[PDB]
Design a protein around this ligand. Structure first.
Ligand SMILES: Nc1ccc(Oc2ncc(Cl)cc2Cl)cc1
Ligand SMILES: Nc1ccc(Oc2ncc(Cl)cc2Cl)cc1
Ligand SMILES: [Ca+2]
Ligand SMILES: [Ca+2]
Ligand SMILES: [Cl-]
Ligand SMILES: [Cl-]
Ligand SMILES: [Cl-]
Ligand SMILES: [Cl-]
Ligand SMILES: [Mg+2]
Ligand SMILES: [Mg+2]
Ligand SMILES: [Mg+2]
Ligand SMILES: [Mg+2]
Lengths: 229, 10, 229, 10
């Protein structure tokens, strides 16, 4: 694309500058350009990719929720049209991320940390699609999210310790999927509780810095359990 | 709404 | 443009929805479409136009300041390139606003409230251009801002009471121009002080709601005077 | 930085 002429290292450098400037659309375009160079991404680079697109889609999700609430309260064409416009842009971003994962980040990811991170992302972006889905493919979108999360869970349980932040963030997001998308609050609670308890029992193995990383995610599990019970 | 993961994970 | 096929009333309605959703780029595109219908804007519509573009350029200004600070501390091409990219987009937004004012909002604005509001906007967007200007036209950009603000000031002093919020916001912004752009802190202080004092002496004529509108802007004058002295 | 006017003015 438009980033094809820029050096990979320059794209990464500019992604970091865009982050500092809170220019997340730019950040995502730079990281898409970096992915399209065809090389695998390092851990730091995978995190930059995720930060960029999560912030872009986050603004779209927040706007969609505002507009959907207005639309539901109203029930001319303008509210529906504008909600649809935001929805379509949101779906486009999700399709873009899913396309990067399919071409060819996931298939080249052999190490647990990369493969789980990308499969979790695949689940997340199908989950964002599911939040707005209403048609004959809502069930299939939900199943796609579930399938990606499940593959990531299976690998994470075999290959990562229970405190690994990627494993924790995956389990957290799969629990949110169960509660918010799949009409499965009991599964959500069970997953969050077992994840929390098994992480707590493994904290003793960690350095101070890793402890901080793991307990930050554990706090989110606890917060959700408080909300859900 | 429920809390989901931060984007950056180590 | 792309909004040419949408009804004026629909563009205004969608601008208000975009505001609620904090989608300021959309809001600005809708209001540009509304201006391009060729009819004069009401007071509420002028405020929507300003809110939209002020938020767009505000994000660009904040990002430009981050990047410029990084660039100055560094003193490869990437920081300069990316600062230039943001700068060029910022200049494009300012040129777009100035173009709407020149074609043909200002020339059709005969009432003091509309004409002063638009001339103030013209000064503001030249001031935003001046914040990033460094070339052989910096002096001319500064003069363009000064000239617009001065014409607005002359009309406001003849046609509006000293508490009028447009008159107050104009005087506030012209004082900022003097302090931050024109290397004229004494003029800035003098203007802010006289503006504040003359407004204070006219508050007794106002209803409770108008009093609130005027004192909100007066507080900004006071805050600046505290910062500047 | 100095404070400037809000966008919306009545
Ligand atoms: N079987 C079960 C018991 C109690 C539960 O409630 C919580 N459990 C752990 C935390 Cl950290 C917080 C809460 Cl609210 C959930 C499941
Ligand atoms: N001649 C002059 C005297 C005092 C000044 O200082 C202030 N004047 C008014 C306010 Cl509201 C606040 C301050 Cl700090 C400025 C100018
Ligand atoms: Ca139960
Ligand atoms: Ca002096
Ligand atoms: Cl629309
Ligand atoms: Cl999958
Ligand atoms: Cl660039
Ligand atoms: Cl002028
Ligand atoms: Mg190269
Ligand atoms: Mg309507
Ligand atoms: Mg019409
Ligand atoms: Mg470099």
């Amino acid at each position: 694309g438009a980033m094809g002429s820029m050096e990979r290292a320059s794209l990464i450098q500019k992604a970091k500058l865009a982050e500092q400037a809170e220019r997340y659309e730019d950040m995502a375009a730079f990281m898409k350009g970096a992915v399209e160079k065809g090389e695998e991404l390092s851990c730091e680079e995978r995190n930059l990719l995720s930060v960029a697109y999560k912030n872009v889609v986050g603004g779209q999700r927040a706007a969609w929720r505002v507009l959907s609430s207005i639309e539901q309260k109203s029930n001319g064409p303008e509210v529906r049209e504008y909600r649809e416009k935001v929805e379509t842009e949101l779906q486009g971003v999700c399709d873009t991320v899913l396309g990067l994962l399919d071409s060819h980040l996931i298939k080249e990811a052999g190490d647990a940390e990369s493969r789980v991170f990308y499969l979790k992302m695949k689940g997340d972006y199908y989950r964002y699609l599911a939040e707005v889905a209403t048609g004959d493919d809502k069930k299939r979108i939900i199943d796609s999210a579930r399938s990606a999360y499940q593959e990531a869970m299976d690998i994470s349980k075999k290959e990562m310790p229970p405190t690994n932040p990627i494993r924790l963030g995956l389990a957290l997001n799969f629990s949110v999927f169960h509660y918010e998308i799949a009409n499965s609050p009991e599964e959500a609670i069970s997953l969050a509780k077992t994840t929390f308890d098994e992480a707590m029992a493994d904290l003793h193995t960690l350095s101070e810095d890793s402890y901080k990383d793991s307990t930050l995610i554990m706090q989110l599990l606890r917060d959700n359990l408080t909300l859900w019970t | 709404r429920s809390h989901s993961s931060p984007a950056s994970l180590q």
